[model samples]
Target: DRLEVCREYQRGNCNRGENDCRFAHPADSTMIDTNDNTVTVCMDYIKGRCSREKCKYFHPPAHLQA
Candidate 1:
């Protein structure tokens, strides 16, 4: 199994650093996942702000179908 995204980090309130934290930080470009997955495209990536080259979250090139 893989770690889920950090809710605290998403809310911009995580107190722990990436190494000390127990959950996934999608915003961090260094983090990657190969087993468990996040099916949704990253909002930050869509907004042209995500820097993760190997991000676990989907990074679609076009507008997603609603």
Candidate 2:
């Protein structure tokens, strides 16, 4: 319950800047390569993991946290 109440903000802390924040949102732009073949999904997509079948843009899973 405490975690839900402290859920990270969607936009992130205004003072730290979006890029500096570790949390990622759907609105985030392509933080990594999309057509590298060698790469799959943005590095920041899966909270710093490559789990996407196709690398288009960084988007975390619904259950993702931190």
Candidate 3:
């Protein structure tokens, strides 16, 4: 049997930043609206591709990341 790993990470539907995304919104007070970031992330994947019900936070401040 052959085992694969590398491609697995690339399997899911990865989304890129969009103007319609929250990332396109202001970077000030709205940040404070989510009760703090669900989590801190690297420079990439800011708005990323989060579900409206899943990743409500801009950074997924720990309380959310299921």
Task: Name the top lDDT candidate.
Answer: 1
Question: Worst 10-residue stretch by lDDT in candidate 2?
Answer: 1-10
Q: For each candidate in the order shown, give its overall lDDT on alpha carbons.
A: 0.58, 0.39, 0.30
TM-score of 2: 0.24
Residues 1-66, model 1: lDDT tens digits = 224666787789989855667565565543445455334556787678999656666554342322
At residue 21, what lDDT does model 3 achieve? 26
Tens digits of per-residue lDDT, candidate 2, 1-66, equal 011111254435345444454443333333433343122234454456656666665454444334
Runs in model 3 deviating more than 4 A are 1-28, 31-57
Ranking by lDDT: 1, 2, 3
Candidate closest to the true structure, highest TM-score: 1
Could you tell me every candidate's TM-score relative to the true structure? Answer: 0.40, 0.24, 0.16
What lDDT score goes with residue 57 in model 2? 58
Sort by TM-score, top down from the best: 1, 2, 3
